[model samples]
Every structure is written in C-alpha cells, then in structure tokens.
Target: DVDLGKLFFCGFDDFNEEAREVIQKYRPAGVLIYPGVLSKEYLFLDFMNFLSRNGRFIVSSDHEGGQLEVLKYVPSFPGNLAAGKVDPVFTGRYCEMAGRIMNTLGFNMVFAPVLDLLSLRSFGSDPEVVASHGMEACMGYFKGGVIPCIKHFPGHGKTADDSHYLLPTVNASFEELWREDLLPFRRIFQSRVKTAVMTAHVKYPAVDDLPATLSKKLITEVLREKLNFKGLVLSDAMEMKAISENFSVEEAVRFFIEAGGNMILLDNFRDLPVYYESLKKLIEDGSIERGKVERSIKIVDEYLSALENRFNSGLIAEVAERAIECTRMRKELLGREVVLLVPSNTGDDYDLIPEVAKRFFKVRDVIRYDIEAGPDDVDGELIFDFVVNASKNEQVLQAHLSLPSDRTIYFIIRNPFDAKFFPGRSVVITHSTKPISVYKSFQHLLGRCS
Candidate 1:
C-alpha cells in the first residue's frame, strides 16, 4: 500500500506534460492550482478530475479573496482586512460565496482566513475581533462546501518582513502571543473546526528556537498537544526564502515532518523529486516515524470526508456586491463632480472607476497618467485619485493633491496601509483594485451603503 503520509501538495503553472509526469511519479496527495491553471476552465477541471480518478486526491488553491484569488476568472470579494472592517456575518457570507465558487471549480481545500495580526492582509489588530471574524470566515468556508485552511500558525503579523523574501523573527513573549496572536487559532481549535492549519516560517525566540515550521515545540507541543487540535498541520511553501535560504530542501522537509507538519507544500515543481525521495528515504530508514505519517493521513481523510459538496451560483453576485465596504469616507464629498485620476500603469486592461462612478455621479473626466505625466489644467468639484503604489509615486501623488478642488479623495487602489501617508481630506481605502472593490468604492461615494 502507498504511504499517504509520504505525499504532499505541489503547484504547476499549466496542465502540461511536465505536470503529468510529476504527478505520475510522485502521486501527490494534493495539487495546488494557481491563476495560470485556473484561468483555463476546461483544462483545470479536466486536470483535477484526472488527478482524483487515479487516486485519493485533494485540489487546493490560495483563493483568499481580493488580489490573492488564484481563480482570476471568478468574481472576487474584498480580502481579510476589508472583511474584518465590516461585520463578521458579512465576512462569513463572503467566504461562503468564495467557497461555493471553489467547490464548483473542483477545489476542495483553500488556504485562507489569514489569522495574522499584522495590518497588511490580516483581519485586524484586536484579538477578539480577529477571533470573531476569523472564525466566521472559517465557518463560512465550511458552509460553502470547501475546506478552510487557517494559516500561518504562531502568526506572521508580528514582524513587517514578508516571509516570501526574508526570514522574519517575532520577538513577542510567549504570554503576549497566547493573549494576542494565538487568540484566533485558540478559538478556531476550541470550536472543533478541524480543517488543515498552515504553519508560519517565522521564528519566535521566546517560544521556540527555530521557525514554527521546523519547531516541534510550536507545532507538536503547542498546536497539537497543548491546544488539542486534531487536524492536518501543513507547512508553508518550502521554496519560500524563509525556508530555502535557511536550510536545504531535504533538510527543510525532514525538519518540517519531524516538527509535526503533516504536509509540506513544494511550490517549485522542479524540486519535487528531490524532497519526495528524501522524505521516503527518511521514512524507510526510520529517521521519521511512520506512525506520525499515518496519523496525518487519517486526519486529512477525515477533513476531506467532512467537506460539504453543495454549490450555489447566486451567492457569487450577492457577495461581489455586499463584501466590499466603505471603511472610512467623507459624506460631504459624495455629491461633487468627480474627476477620477487613475494611474496609467495599473496593469489592468480596463478602467473600472469611470464605469462604476457613472452609475451614481456625473464623472467630470477620467485622466490616466504615469509618474512622469506633467501637471495639467484639470478642475473638478471633487478629485478622486486612484493610486496603485503611493510610496513609489509620492511626487505624482503630492502634485495631484496640490490640484484645486473642493475636496480631494485619495482612493488607494493597492495596500490600504499607504492611505495613512497621503494628506487627502477625504481618504478612501479599498484594500484592492479589483472590479468589485472599485464598484464598492463608487457605491460608498454614492451613499448607497448601510
């Protein structure tokens, strides 16, 4: 019998010969599909079906809403931060909507409800708020028929460094983490939401010596034993700089499994065999216990069995409209003649601001400009500047703010964190530039939201 624990998750850019060969050879327990594969509906569905037909398989994606969505063709709701700002019930509804879409597309598992406490993509700073909203999103995913995999255990929000590039360290005391960072996780565990939990590549010196992904004290002791979590413990992508840069792929896989990680996500397809063989050998040599592997396989099997299979097409449209909210807005600037200034290099093919705004207000004009675009004689009752990167084009942003207008509303299209730096009187943070977010921003400007 094939050892189910020996298999893990891996990603592919396309449903091609290389992917087929890798799947045939490794027989991965799950496949992680990104936008490249998801964009081609027939191929994506066909490929996932093929993988499952051969053996017990789970299809997963990182469809965490907003720009993080892997299925670009489907409608997107606002990400965690936006959902956190709104009611938890709405967040739950939005996730249920997202889950339905995933179930329709053959994805059973999704890496979501990012429980990180940081302001970047996290729900919010408050522990109780995070717990409430995070649990709602988790339950919502389950309700929508897809398995919700709560992520970055021990929390990735304590440090500002992105684990994709750097190995960040969290200096918070163990007590502080239990009080703040661990609240959402504790709540999720206590509620018996026994879905997969992804680990963080961050090191907390006070709690553990190594990063949580490689620390038995964090994964086995704290998450599994102390918290009594009876679910799969997945390691974040092994190819991330936080793991790859610090240790060899072989070493990382062994350490992760030893640390009580049930599945190691090998995002880089090229290194799949190297790690797979290494893990097999480790198991064969009794370096890694087989009982641990069996336990994880059983947990994953239970998780898959518990997943819902219902799909509703209508939830998509409902969530697309309701999930996006106007966190902060100036009521006085709603009725003004809006001059929408969008960045030229937004990377999006169509401008959504003019189309979305025309529904509520008389759009004076929409001007597209890059960083080098010179100041123009533009006049409007209200100026809505759509900025993708506020930090990169501070000069252009400042010049636009200098324009004469009754009230200037800075619509930060990218990270809402940058909204604080701009000096606009009427600042609006969408947290995303997705069409849904753009539509919601206009909806808020039109004073349509409750």
Candidate 2:
C-alpha cells in the first residue's frame, strides 16, 4: 500500500531509503506504486528488480485516465499523445497509452480507466459524452495488453462532490443506474477484457444499504453473478473517508475479503505495517480463511504473469497508438450529436454568446429569442430547431409553448439554485459570480450537448 499525500504525483519518485526500509521491515506481500512521478526508465527497471529480489509484488495507478499531468512527467513513459492537452476524442487513447507505458515499465498491475462516468460532478459532467469517452478509454487499455481497472464503481458520476474528502451518495434508483450509467462497465465486461475491478465507497440505496465496496450482493451477486466478471475484485483505499468514518481497519479488511474482494488496497502508507499485522491475525484466527487468501493470491499471480509477458514484448508503442485512436473515435462519437440552447441576454459584454452558439450551429443559423416579444418571443418557433435558453430573465418560462414541438438546451447565466427555475430538457449552471472557468466549462459542456 502507498500513501499519496498529494506530494509526489506518481510512484516513480516515491521510492527512497525510507520506502526501501519499510519494505524490508514489514516484508509486505505487495506494494502498489505509481510510476507517474519519476523521470527515469531505469528507476522502474531497478525498482522492479529490487521488488522481485525481495519476493514482493508491486502495482500502480494511472487513474487520471484522460488527465495526463502525471504521464507527461515520466521521461520513458510513452503516452504523450495529447502532450498535456485534452481532446475529448482522445480519452480512450489516454488510457491505452497509459496501459502501454505501464506494461513497458514491467508493472504487472495498474489502477486505471476511472469508471466514474462524467456527470454534473464529472469535472465537466456530461453523461452522454462521458459514456462515449469511457468505452473508448476502457477498450483501448484492454487491447493494449494491459489490465485496465474501471474504478470508483458502481458510480461516482452523479455527484458534484469529491469522495476523496467526503462520502457522497447517489440517490438514484437501480433502474436509474442501468439507464443513465453503468453502460461502460457492461460494455467492458462484454469485451471479454480481464481487469482488476475496484469498488467505490459511495452508497447506492437502491442496490444495498452498505457502500458498494463492502456489499457482497454488489461485488459477488451483481458484479460476479449478474455481470459475470471473472477477474480480481479490489476494494478502494481503506483510508478513504467513506470507509474510515464507518469501520475499523480490521473490520473493513475482514468484511471486504468476506464480501468477495480478492485484494484490499489499503493505499494509506502510514499504517501499512499495522494493517498488515491485522490481516495476518485475521488469517490466523480463521476470520479470513486461508482458502480466500489462496484464491486471491492465485488471481493476482495470474494477472502479474500476464503483465510480465507483455512487458518483454516491446509492444508499448503499438498500444500507445491504439489508445490514441480509440480516444479520437469516442470523442468524435460524442461530438457528433451535441445540441446547445442558450437564453439571449441583451448585454454587449457577453463574448461567449456567439462562441457558444457557434459550437452548436453555424453562425448564420443562430437563434435569439427576443425579450420584447414578452413571454411569447421565442426564436425558431416555426423552424423546429433546437433552442438554447441562455436568457437571464424569465422569458424562457414561455419555453413550454415551444417545448412539445422542439428540443431545448437551457443555460442559466444566473443563480439557479432554486428548483423552480430548473428546465425539463437540459440545464447548466453558469453561476452568477462570473468566474472565467465557469463560463469556459459551460461552453465546453455545450459543445457536447446531445
């Protein structure tokens, strides 16, 4: 387990005398490392040699998937497709490229292809767009001969909050998950791709009372039985707020293994030795059976063996190329059907007015609903075109008259916290405070409107 205090971006630079000393002292069976932070290829080569010499296993996380800030730092890391840029069309490429890099680095395991589909909380949550990007990301990695783990499952895409600091709840029903989310996981599973599935700590009441990570019905019944995934299942870090606030380390580990997790990733590096002892005692007391340990060890070993073989093949460049191609395809798929609706405000300072409209339509075809027409002054009434309600006033309240005949894209350029102002079609929060990021992100979201 590795404790990421947000210091080193990835595990490559995480090693030093202290880390080496810990490995020697605890003699942990495995340690998950992130290769994103280091600059030397020989660093990974030497580290792997060291671990192998100590008879220990090492895993890593490249979960930034489309966000490649860490990837750019590694000198030998190959996935430089975007070069610190984000092309919605290349999200899959990011995953594939990362997988290739991990495989080349001789890493047998990786935490990657974050399964949380973008939602309102999705950095720039756009469900339809994210689902498209996610499929490409997962597939690209799988095809790259590296095990890509889809994580923060079952869904962290629904909330605007980050679970790293707090445990978020997705109040949607099971039907909602099946309909709006979980599509990528379904697709990944059907692809016959082997992965180390990681469970989210968030709660889904429709599925189970406990968080998905600790739910047997969710991990075994749904993921294993219903989804029919026959891969290593892992629990998210035990130190996360979701588990730490609810259960002790011992209880968490015991329940996780019993709940069908093949491995418990206690990534908090501070207390690893203590937790390692707890797990050892649990095994001794039969609270965690030896059979379970053996099963987990077997699955993990199989994954490592496959990883070792791929590392020797000199296939990193090819995998990186596929990743780029897949991401580009998904981006194109997402950008194809986007629609934007903006409410017209009579302000000269609104530079984004034309730019936002241009994202959805040619400049010549942009529609503007006039405020002088009172409640009935909507543009494209007879045109049957998509409408973007970017109005600052209640003129969009007249939208009902145009709704039955045409689709509407609503962007509230004001404080829309009150539920009474919510639009039935699509709505975006451009927050009244006027932050540059808010408007920019709003435009980006509109570009992918569907």
Candidate 3:
C-alpha cells in the first residue's frame, strides 16, 4: 500500500555515480538540482534525460529569479520585490518567462512564488498586494507549463532569524497571524491555482511547539483541513539547521510523515540512502502508517501526471523585454545633467547606473558619499541618489530633501519597499542591482519604453 519511492525528494550538486545509483535503487519521488548541476549545459541536459528515463520525477529548483537564480545559464530577471513594486501583470509575465526556462531545462516544479510578507524577505508587506501579484505569477508559471510551489506556509516573513541557519520563532497570536501573515496564503488557497506548498522551518509558539514543518495542527488542521489544500505538501530541506540541529534525521523524517507532510526534501545525496533506510525501518515498525504514505504517493503521482512538456527558446527574450517594463518612473529624466550619488560601499559594484546614464544625459559628476552620514553639498541640475537600504538612512533622506536642486530622484537598488521613505519628486525602484535590472532602470529613465 505504501509507495516508498514517492515520499522522498533528494538533492544533488552533480550527476555523479552516487546520484545515478540512488535514482536506480531508492527511486525518489523527485530530485532537486542545484547550481553545480546547472554549470554545464550538456551534462545537465544529459543528466535530466537520464532522470526522465528512470521515472516521471519532479525536477525542481529554487529559481525565484534575481540573485536567487539556480540556472545561471538562463537570462536572469528582477525578483518578486521588484515585481511587487510594478504591476501584478508584469509579475505574471516574469514568472511565465522563468517557468518557460525551467520547463526547457526539464524541470517541472519550481519552489517559488514565496507567499511570505516583507519583514525579512523580498515579498511586499501588504497582503492584498502580495496575493494579487503571487496569484498572477502562479498563473504565469502554469501557463508556461511548470508547477509553482507557494512557499514557507503559515509564513516565514515575521521571523527575525533565517531558518536556514537556526529555528526562528514567531511570537504573534493566531489572530494576528491569520490577519496579516496568513492572508496571502488564504488568497492563494481560495484561487486554487497553486499545485504545491513548501512548509516553513520557523516555529509559531502560539500555534504549536514544533516547527510548522513537523506540526500536525499547522499541516493537517490549518493547511489541509481548514484551507482545504488537496495538493502536495513538501518539507523545507531537512538538512537545514532548524530541522537537523533539533531532531535526529530519523526522528524528523518519521515526525514529518506522521504530521502529514507529503514529501521530505533531503538536499544532500549522501543522506538519501540513510533516509531511505530510516523511512523503510519506520514503516516496518509501524511508526508511520501505510495509509498516510499512500495518500502522499497519490498526490505526487497526480502532480507529476499533470505537468506539461512544452519548451520555446524565444520566451526568454520576450520575458526579459517585458520585465524591463516593471521599472516604474514617476517622470522622465532625459537631457538633464544628472548627479548620481551612490553609497561609498556599493559605489564600485553599481557603476552601471552612471555608465548607462552617460549615453542619454550629461553626467554632472558621480558622488560617492557615506549614506549613513548623509550627502554633502553636491551641486547639480538633477540628483539621482542610488540607495541600497533606504530605511536605515532616514537622515540621508531628510538631507537630500533639503538640497537645492532642479529635481531629485531616488533609485532604490535593493528593497523597493523603502521607496516610501524617500521624499524625492522622482523615484525609481529597480528591486535589484542585477545587470538586467540596472539596464532596464536606465532604459525607462531615458524614455526608451512607454
């Protein structure tokens, strides 16, 4: 009754002999391919073909775009934070492009469209905004023939620490969580657009002592029963400190299954055989019910069966062209002498802005200032302050506002949410300093796009 092959999702850095052996022997439900596997195009495709021949395995990655891209060979686009600042439609198009690339590379599942809010991650703080953009993005991924997995269920945004390193705890009451953090997930569930959800490693003391990844009340009661999610439910990598440091691999694997987790993601090939043995032992000893394992196998089978195999090369350029449209400009800044102020620390890396600006306008001078100490007397017809973390430099914002200039613009490079703090007349939120993001920001500023 129990399908041992459908319970585990293994990860590999390389498509080596060990990885091949695991596929042939354990026959995991899926395989998470990392950047190392992606480094070589020929080998990656060959390995993907090999995996496909074995079974209809769920090939997935954390390809959320921006700096989080696992597929280095593909064209990188701005991530959700940037997409949040722009129209949700563009976000959808962006995800569509990303999904197309994933599909082309033989990946059916992408662990993305992070439903968490903007406390620590790139997602925006507003629930309605996040839901709107996230749902559209999910639609885009589906249209592109890739299954999108909405992530960090219950929510990881409110936590102060990164669960990848340690277990971060959320102290918010259930009502507060339901109101704010859980709102986006609720909208996603109601839409019935998402096919999978990845559990958060963080603990919510108000809800349960165990992390949501291993909590029955959160997984079964909240996600499955209350939200009525019939799709696959995946655990965040069991190798992470949040799970690995607290529970033994055997105990965590058993508890996750007992708590109703559909798949356990072990992001290490070495641990696959160990976890396979542990899972087999647990089932033999009756620690995990055969019925539960069968239920998970059914979900995985259905998810894999529904995936599309379409691929198109032109979709990459189309997505890149459309993503540039996300760069919003309050007013055009062409033909004016622009004074570009960059933070002294990030000045070297972000010279792309000034270099791009010179093509359309006269460069007054690129001023490097300590964003913390604020700018000195920099004279120019227009001021374009390239800020990374705008929230941390409130005084700098105030000082820039006091400056005598023709027009002031804030080019927020990292968190576009910080754009609200700057009082400049013209503001542009690029969301990231990736080469594509920078080039698009300049293109929009120069009136190249409508």
Winning model by lDDT: 3
- Misplaced by over 4 Å in model 2 are 1-13, 24-30, 34-49, 56-58, 63-68, 73-92, 120-132, 309-450
Residues 346-401, candidate 2, lDDT per residue (tens digit)?
Answer: 24424345543443333334444543332343343222122233234555445533
List the pairs of residues colliding in candidate 3.
none
Show the lowest summed lDDT stretch of 10 residues, model 1.
311-320
Sort the predicted structures by lDDT, highest score first.
Answer: 3, 1, 2
User: Which lDDT tens digits does candidate 3 get at residues 1-450?
Assistant: 335878888888877567788788888888888877666333365466567567678888888877588787557777788888888999888888878777886778888888888872355998888888888888998877689888889888887798889999999888888888888788878885756899999899988999999999999888889888888999999999998999998888888999889999988877888888898899889999988988988888888788646543334323333444233443544557888887677344565566556655688899877767767766677777776665665676666566553466667777777767755345676656654456456656666433
In the range 217-286, model 1's lDDT, one tens digit per residue, is 9988899898888778888988999988999877887788888888888886656888888888888888
Query: Model 2 residue 280 lDDT?
Result: 76
lDDT of each: 0.74, 0.54, 0.77
